[PDB]
Amino acid sequence: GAVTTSQIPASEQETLVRPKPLLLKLLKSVGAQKDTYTMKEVLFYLGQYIMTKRLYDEKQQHIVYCSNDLLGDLFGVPSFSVKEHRKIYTMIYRNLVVV
Numbered sequence: 001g002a003v004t005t006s007q008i009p010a011s012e013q014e015t016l017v018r019p020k021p022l023l024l025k026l027l028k029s030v031g032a033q034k035d036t037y038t039m040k041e042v043l044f045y046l047g048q049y050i051m052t053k054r055l056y057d058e059k060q061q062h063i064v065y066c067s068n069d070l071l072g073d074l075f076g077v078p079s080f081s082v083k084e085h086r087k088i089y090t091m092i093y094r095n096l097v098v099v
């Protein structure tokens, strides 16, 4: 229940975080049962959320469109590239408290 990337330092992906209410709701909707997570766990559950909500059907194009989903409100963008991992981390950090 974790996903990692070479674009971000490994240790950063172990950062302990407490999601604020919207982020926490999204994670719990796909089976998360806690209040505190590592970042790589947050990325896993958010990935599961994205696929469950059908926000990434075009696998070849690497754009996620989320303008009309809770995810769009969470991140503050209509769309983002799944390949820009630092940008994704930045957007997630705004929605949690770092322990």
Ligand SMILES: CC(C)(C)S(=O)(=O)C[C@H](C1CC1)N1C(=O)[C@@](C)(Cc2ccc(C(=O)O)cn2)O[C@H](c2cccc(Cl)c2)[C@H]1c1ccc(Cl)cc1
Binding pocket: 003, 004, 005, 043, 044, 046, 047, 048, 050, 051, 056, 062, 064, 082, 083, 084, 085, 086, 088, 089
């Ligand atoms: C089911 C899988 C295959 C394990 S997955 O990795 O969770 C699928 C998701 C998808 C829902 C968006 N996802 C991805 O597909 C991909 C593989 C997209 C991707 C494709 C190619 C390249 C490259 O060539 O450099 C880089 N990144 O990884 C996303 C990811 C993984 C770890 C950390 C981060 Cl920040 C993003 C990663 C992702 C993107 C966004 C978010 Cl919020 C969460 C995970």
